[PDB]
């Protein structure tokens, strides 16, 4: 009944365009930049990226991990604060109320989440800059209204092979069952907390249920986005396939399927983390529920 990893916490900025994760590469835009270096492979006019793209994105990623590493002192502050609210035995050692200690969790949690953003603010402009350098680089293609779609649909074929490698329904019925068994106990404690006069364990259960909710909606959020990614590129394969498009439409294309794939890789990374986090939180509530029903004397 102790949480050793709090990587499930995340925050997006006021743009709602940048979602910061504790897992590498912290920005889904990094995966999109990796996919563009595979786009410049097939085009002879912009093969210079393979040298200029790697030197640019690698420093953005290295600064992204540097930014999140600064908040480690604040990361451990709430990692040790939820270990007190989760464990009644560890809570019975300190000498402060549950509400007074719960406000320390909330205040220091926002400090940790807010730190992840403030340290990455100057990186938010660096992503916009590389996006521009990617768009302007595509202007060097020796086409105007005759740009070739061959490489555009080659990546579509490869992406749907990579997307079937993940079992979507395995994640879908997992969270549906865990959410059904989550609200079960939420609507349950509220109906039995008055029969058993025990405030130490039930307060710890409601808190571990509060974080269980947050982790769940983070799972359903990333689950939809990888579902939306898979459905959209599938329709691109089942849709019209012209041989020639304007140079601006091709830039729309690479940015479309490039972002579609980065959301898939970013979601699949956090979905597996949230899975291991949900089961760990559920193991805590299950055993502190057994202590509530195991001592009827």
């Amino acid at each position: 009944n102790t949480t050793d990893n709090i990587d499930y916490f995340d925050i997006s900025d006021e743009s709602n365009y940048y979602l910061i994760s504790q897992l590498r590469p912290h920005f889904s835009n990094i995966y999109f930049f990796d996919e563009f270096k595979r786009y410049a492979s097939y085009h002879t006019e912009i093969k210079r990226y393979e040298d200029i793209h790697k030197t640019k994105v690698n420093s953005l990623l290295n600064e992204a991990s540097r930014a999140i590493g600064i908040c480690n002192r604040a990361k451990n502050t709430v990692k040790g604060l939820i270990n007190i609210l989760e464990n009644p035995q560890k809570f019975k050692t300190q000498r402060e109320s549950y509400d007074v200690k719960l406000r320390q969790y909330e205040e220091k949690k926002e400090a940790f989440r807010g730190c992840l953003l403030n340290k990455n603010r100057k990186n938010l402009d660096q992503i916009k800059k590389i996006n521009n350098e990617i768009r302007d680089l595509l202007e060097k293609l020796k086409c105007s209204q005759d740009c070739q779609t061959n490489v555009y649909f080659d990546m579509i074929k490869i992406y749907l092979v990579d997307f079937k490698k993940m079992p979507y329904e395995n994640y879908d019925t997992f969270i549906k069952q865990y959410k059904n068994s989550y609200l079960s106990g939420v609507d349950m404690i509220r109906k039995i907390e008055k029969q058993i006069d025990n405030p130490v364990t039930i307060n710890a259960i409601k808190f571990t249920q509060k974080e269980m909710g947050y982790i769940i909606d983070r799972f359903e959020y990333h689950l939809q986005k990888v579902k939306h990614s898979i459905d959209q590129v599938t329709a691109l394969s089942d849709g019209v396939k012209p041989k020639q498009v304007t140079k601006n439409r091709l830039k729309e294309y690479y940015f479309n399927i490039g972002n579609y794939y980065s959301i898939f890789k970013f979601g699949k990374d956090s979905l597996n983390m949230l899975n291991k986090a949900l089961i760990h939180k559920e193991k805590i509530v299950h055993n502190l529920l057994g202590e509530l029903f195991g001592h009827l004397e």
Epitope: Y17, N29, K122, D125, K128, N131, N132, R135, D136, N259
Partner: antibody, heavy 126, light 108 residues
Framework: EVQLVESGGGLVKPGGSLRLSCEAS????????MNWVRQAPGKGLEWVSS????????FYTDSVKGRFTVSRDNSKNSLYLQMDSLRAEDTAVYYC???????????????????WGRGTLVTVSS | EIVLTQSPATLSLSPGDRATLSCRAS??????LAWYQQKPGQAPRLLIY???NRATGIPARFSGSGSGTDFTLTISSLEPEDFAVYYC?????????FGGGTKVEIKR
């Protein structure tokens, strides 16, 4: 309403210094780059300097390099231009301009100017 | 500095005519050129970004063309409002430079 309101213009002798302000409202100031464009009386547009969304990078025109400085306070939705060691050729109407940013599948911008302010007059003469 | 020359320095046409203004650059700026419009006592107004893309809200009569060094702003049929000064501007290389601007005026 979306607007840019300049401030702090005036008059100073050669070698003096002034600080121009610009208060934006109607949009999220942090997501846009900002610029300063000046126009001499009866003459054309000259770009002065630019700053990115979160002060990650700043740029200047050669004529003011080493004399001017740009800063922004996203908490106060404010853009600043510190003009030190002013010269006669600095007499112009200074404009606060917003960089044209596009919100599509990703955020991208151009080094053009889609939003302007009324501007303030800066006169430098002995 | 990448200078932008805009000759003819001024045009004298009437409503209904077609104004075709030019902007030539010293170095090549690819297609990273913009067009502005400025009336007396007002701020400039963005018309076109990256040669041929119209800004939001401005009428469709404004067209854009050109690549490399020679560029063209085209007004299909002028309106009483369109009479003002038009500046070109490049964003390719640092030291952002404007053109000399050319004023279109009513012919009488």
């Amino acid at each position: 309403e979306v607007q840019l309101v300049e401030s702090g213009g005036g008059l100073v002798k050669p070698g003096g210094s002034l600080r121009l302000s610009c208060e934006a409202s109607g949009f999220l100031f942090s997501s846009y780059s900002m610029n300063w464009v000046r126009q001499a009386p009866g003459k054309g547009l000259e770009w002065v300097s630019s700053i990115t969304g979160y002060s990650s990078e700043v740029f200047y025109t050669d004529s003011v390099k080493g004399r001017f400085t740009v800063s922004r306070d996203n908490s106060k939705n404010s853009l600043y231009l510190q003009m030190d060691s002013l010269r006669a050729e600095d007499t112009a109407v200074y404009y606060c301009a917003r960089a044209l940013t596009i919100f599509g599948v990703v955020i991208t911008d151009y080094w053009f100017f889609d939003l302007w302010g009324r501007g303030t007059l800066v006169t430098v003469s002995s | 500095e990448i200078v932008l020359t805009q000759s003819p320095a001024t045009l004298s046409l009437s409503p209904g005519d077609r104004a075709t203004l030019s902007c030539r650059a010293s170095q090549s700026v690819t297609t990273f050129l913009a067009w502005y419009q400025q009336k007396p006592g007002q701020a400039p107004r963005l018309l076109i970004y990256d040669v041929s893309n119209r800004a939001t809200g401005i009428p469709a009569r404004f067209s854009g063309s050109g690549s490399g060094t020679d560029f063209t702003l085209t007004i299909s049929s002028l309106e009483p409002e369109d009479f003002a000064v038009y500046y070109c501007q490049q964003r390719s290389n640092w030291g952002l430079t404007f053109g000399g601007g050319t004023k279109v005026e009513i012919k009488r």
